[PDB]
Design a protein around this nucleic acid. Structure first.
Ligand code: MG
Ligand code: MG
Ligand code: MG
Ligand code: MG
Ligand code: MG
Ligand code: MG
Ligand code: MG
Ligand code: MG
Ligand code: MG
Ligand code: MG
Ligand code: MG
Ligand code: MG
Ligand code: MG
Ligand code: MG
Ligand code: MG
Ligand code: MG
Ligand code: MG
Ligand code: MG
Ligand code: MG
Ligand code: MG
Ligand code: MG
Ligand code: MG
Ligand code: MG
Ligand code: MG
Ligand code: MG
Ligand code: MG
Ligand code: MG
Ligand code: MG
Ligand code: ZN
Lengths: 38, 76, 136, 96, 94
RNA sequence: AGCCAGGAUGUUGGCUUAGAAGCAGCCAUCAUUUAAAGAAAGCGUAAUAGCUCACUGGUCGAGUCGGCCUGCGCGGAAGAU
RNA sequence: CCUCCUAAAGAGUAACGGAGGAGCACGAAGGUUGGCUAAUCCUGGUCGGACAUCAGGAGGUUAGUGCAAUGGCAUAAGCCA
RNA sequence: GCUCAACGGAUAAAAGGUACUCCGGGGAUAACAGGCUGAUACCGCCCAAGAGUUCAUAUCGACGGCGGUGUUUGGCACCUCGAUGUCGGCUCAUCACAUCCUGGGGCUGAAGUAGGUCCCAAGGGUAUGGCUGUUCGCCAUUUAAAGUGGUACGCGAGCUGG
């Protein structure tokens, strides 16, 4: 979990989703890629 | 610092403006160069101070090939 | 790091930075990075931006730096009281008004140029925008 | 016969490799001195060298001086290491 | 080729111009030949799209104002400093 | 947008490298069988192999894509009785 | 004490604000009459060369002002008699 | 006839020390603490050149950019000069969380053990000595850990006075 101010799609498999009013990158392929805005 | 100095202000500039009726001898312009040139009935001082040589109204004008400001006095 | 070779005067008044810019259009290049924001780019900042963009463009196509840091900014040394003359010149700025084309670029594809400009932009303090060559 | 080696530039140490401590002075002497933390201890994290400075009233000035001292020490260390290696080499040469 | 619709400007000046700009219109002028200058307003959005094309500046345009087809060429365009916008256009009767 | 299929040939392009076979780079970036297939976008390998992708064929049967302009919001946002 | 800027287009206007000068000189460097027009560059020319002195052109005051800076100055306030 | 140049020129004619001091005043004006501020400091974040065999973003992150805190060095001189006692130690603490331990979790360049890093978490806990007036620090030996800060750099009408 990379908590950042800027969250970005790092690959094709990265998807940006909003969960309970928090922007999140979740990725099916790469576990490293998953992010959270904080 | 090497900077704190400046000279006393010399209170120059146009003293009597266009249309202003003056007595003879009245200073019209205090100036450094001949920023204004002495026209009709205006004398130029030693420090280029323009003064009326006759009673009447100040008349600024642009005259001549060099397009210079001439101050004349027109009699009333 | 850009700086005037010679100067008429070693220090300078603060001044104000109000108004719109004059170098508004893409003149030389094909694409430009136009400043949207008001502020002041230091020499350092400008250089950084240039470095960012050149690398991005991989030494292919020309870059112009339309801005120049011609204004010296003084800083008083630390732990020094408020009197005793003006501080020493530390760095040089270009004062930036909205509308300022900061950088210009040609000999590049458009997308790549855009990318380069974006890269540059993060180095600069002001909010900026990509612009293009306009006929008239 | 020895080759003309390129004289490498003495590299600037990073603030990441450095610990900067600030603290009160010894003996001091006054009210403002008891409060103020002017003294500077710079420490190199990879090597373990320390430089102290408390000559100046200004903390910044002290730090600058301390920084310089640290740099000098680093240079000296580099020189020493160079010398040691050199010494090994000749010792080996002497062996012949 | 390009047919633009215009209205004759009632009020001229700075404030008026600003108001026009606010209301998604923009001031323009037709001038040239023996005929007097004609100040017009133009709907901004429509004109911006037209001006995106390079053919806009090259070709003869037709400005229709008060049911009168005036054949013109774009002479100079003022743009907003930092926005994709038009402050003003000068037109020359061709 | 899913889904099913192909996703080749000269060829592993040479070089320089310990090896380099789309993927260490350096460089050229062609043509072929053509429905389409980059001297290759990512994963992968000692390197090959292998796994994806681009583009394309089939199914399916109505809107869809991503820029611009602006209005209002979200995160960015930690302190001591 | 003088000049400029700060100084907000009359005057004036502060700071341990930013820049520079003066504590004189000259019996001509003053008065007047008469006359004259600069810097720099190119080309040619004994010694003579980037640079003396002589021509001619371009040039147009970029020069000059007994000295700081500013304002002036061909009607020259500049240069000769 | 005056570098009366401290140039409206106090005399013709004049350096200093005072911690042995004294009086009159001033928070008009300094040292402490408070306040405003935040350059500096500390703590974040944005961009990503690169390092990381390969691979920017496991972990680092250059050139630059944007913040927060009030937290160091400062700036200011608003509070106090008809007194607001100063570092440290002791005795008592109390709050913050930017968490040192213990608890929960993500990613890992996470096999395991042990780590690294980030998120959540302030319930409780969080060393004895040697040296130095010390804070700090270095060292010795522990410890699950020996947190970082605020509190007039907490606390002298509670002690000490190095
Ligand atoms: Mg301007
Ligand atoms: Mg108005
Ligand atoms: Mg917000
Ligand atoms: Mg004035
Ligand atoms: Mg005024
Ligand atoms: Mg004469
Ligand atoms: Mg004369
Ligand atoms: Mg006096
Ligand atoms: Mg006096
Ligand atoms: Mg004493
Ligand atoms: Mg007393
Ligand atoms: Mg204080
Ligand atoms: Mg108080
Ligand atoms: Mg604040
Ligand atoms: Mg950095
Ligand atoms: Mg006060
Ligand atoms: Mg005051
Ligand atoms: Mg007091
Ligand atoms: Mg009292
Ligand atoms: Mg927390
Ligand atoms: Mg963990
Ligand atoms: Mg409970
Ligand atoms: Mg003992
Ligand atoms: Mg205390
Ligand atoms: Mg005490
Ligand atoms: Mg007592
Ligand atoms: Mg009390
Ligand atoms: Mg004692
Ligand atoms: Zn991903």
């Amino acid at each position: 979990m990379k908590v950042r101010a800027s969250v970005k799609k790092l690959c094709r498999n990265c998807k940006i989703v909003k969960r309970d009013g928090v922007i999140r990158v979740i990725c099916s392929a790469e576990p490293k890629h998953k992010q959270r805005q904080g | 610092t090497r900077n704190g100095r400046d000279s006393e202000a010399k209170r120059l500039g146009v003293k009597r403006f266009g249309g202003e009726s003056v007595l003879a001898g009245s200073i019209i312009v205090r100036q450094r160069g001949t920023k204004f040139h002495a026209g009709a009935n205006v004398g130029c001082g030693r420090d280029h101070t323009l003064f009326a040589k006759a009673d009447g109204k100040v008349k600024f004008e642009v005259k001549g090939p060099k397009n210079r400001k001439f101050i004349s006095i027109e009699a009333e | 790091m850009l700086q005037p070779k010679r100067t008429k005067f070693r220090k300078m008044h603060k001044g104000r930075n109000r108004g719109l810019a004059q170098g508004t259009d893409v003149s030389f290049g094909s694409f430009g990075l136009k400043a949207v924001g008001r502020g002041r780019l230091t020499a350092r900042q400008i250089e950084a931006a240039r470095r960012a963009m050149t690398r991005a463009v991989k030494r292919q196509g020309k870059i112009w730096i339309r801005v120049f840091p011609d204004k010296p900014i003084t800083e008083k040394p630390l732990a020094v009281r408020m009197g005793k003359g003006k501080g020493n010149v530390e760095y040089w700025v270009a004062l930036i008004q909205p509308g300022k084309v900061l950088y210009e670029m040609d000999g590049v594809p458009e997308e790549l140029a855009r990318e380069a400009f974006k890269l540059a932009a993060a180095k600069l303090p002001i909010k900026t925008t990509f612009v293009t060559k306009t006929v008239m | 016969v020895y080759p003309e080696v390129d004289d490498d530039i003495d590299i600037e140490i990073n603030p990441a490799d450095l610990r900067i401590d600030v603290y009160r002075t010894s003996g001091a002497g006054g009210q403002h001195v008891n409060r103020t933390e002017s003294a500077v201890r710079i420490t190199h994290i990879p090597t373990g060298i320390v430089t102290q400075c408390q000559n100046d009233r200004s903390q910044h000035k002290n730090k600058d001086q301390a920084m310089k001292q640290m740099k000098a020490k680093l240079y000296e260390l580099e020189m020493q290491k160079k010398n040691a290696e050199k010494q090994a080499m000749e010792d080996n040469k002497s062996d012949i | 080729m390009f047919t633009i619709n215009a209205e004759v400007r009632k009020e001229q000046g700075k404030g008026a111009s600003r108001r026009l700009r606010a209301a998604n219109k923009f001031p323009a002028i037709i001038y040239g030949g023996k005929e007097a200058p004609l100040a017009i307003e133009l709907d901004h959005d429509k004109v911006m799209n037209m001006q995106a094309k390079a053919e806009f500046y090259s070709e003869v345009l037709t400005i229709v104002v008060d049911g009168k087809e005036i054949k013109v060429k774009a002479q100079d365009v003022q743009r907003h400093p930092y926005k994709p916008k038009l402050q003003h256009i000068d037109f020359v009767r061709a």
